Design a protein around this ligand. Structure first.
Ligand SMILES: O=C(O)CCC(=O)C(=O)O
Ligand SMILES: [Mn+2]
Length: 213
């Protein structure tokens, strides 16, 4: 019934207005990047990174490069590891060549690695920390990015998405405007049925607040 359908669809159009998607990477180019992601996981497992580079959760690990953060604040310089050369060579440079982002934009790369059933709770990328657009490239498997969900308790549930955005393996997702600023996004446990990883590429604001030593 409407007005529900009408009002949901109206906001979904607003969200979509701030979403651009690209492919660019072939599946063979994806497998190559996936091999590098596996190398990062292995290196972290051997404890070869700086402490704040690696954050571990039940079904999800995050790997912070370039900049890390926590009212959110960046860590002091040198607390997380530098962006690996392969992220520049295989991912950032490709997106620059294709005009998705300008040269020198990206100074933060985060890899999220999800096991089946993994998720990330609804949030807005800290607007006082990160410039827009926010760019992500997805790997290993197909999934979906949802907008506007609430993660509820008593009992545990995730509410209905305002927008459900399919994200194929190799998909490039570019968030701006409404989709980046005016609504949350998340990954629902139900949309991670197999291992999936994502590289999130961002520019920190020159005036982003930073912890001191
Ligand atoms: O997994 C994704 O595509 C997005 C993850 C995300 O939004 C985040 O890590 O801040
Ligand atoms: Mn996010």
């Amino acid at each position: 019934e409407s007005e529900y359908e009408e009002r949901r669809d109206a906001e979904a159009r607003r969200v979509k207005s701030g979403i651009k998607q690209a492919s660019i990477f072939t599946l063979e180019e994806c497998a190559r990047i996936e091999a590098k992601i596996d190398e990062v996981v292995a290196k972290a497992d051997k404890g070869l990174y700086r402490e704040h580079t690696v954050d571990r959760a039940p079904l999800r690990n995050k790997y912070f490069f370039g900049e890390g953060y926590t009212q959110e604040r960046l860590y002091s310089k040198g607390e997380v590891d530098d962006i690996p050369d392969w992220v520049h060579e295989l991912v950032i440079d490709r997106l620059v060549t294709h005009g998705v982002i300008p040269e020198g934009f990206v100074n933060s790369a985060v890899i999220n690695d999800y096991q089946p059933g993994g998720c990330i709770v609804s949030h807005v990328d800290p607007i006082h920390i990160f410039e827009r657009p926010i760019v992500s490239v997805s790997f290993f498997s197909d999934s979906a990015l949802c907008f506007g969900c609430k993660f509820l308790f008593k009992p545990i549930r995730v509410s209905e998405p305002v927008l459900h955005l399919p994200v194929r393996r190799g998909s490039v997702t570019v968030l701006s405007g409404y989709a980046a600023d005016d609504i949350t996004h998340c990954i629902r446990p139900q949309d991670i049925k197999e291992r999936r990883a994502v590289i999130i590429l961002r520019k920190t604001r020159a005036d982003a607040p930073r912890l001191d030593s």
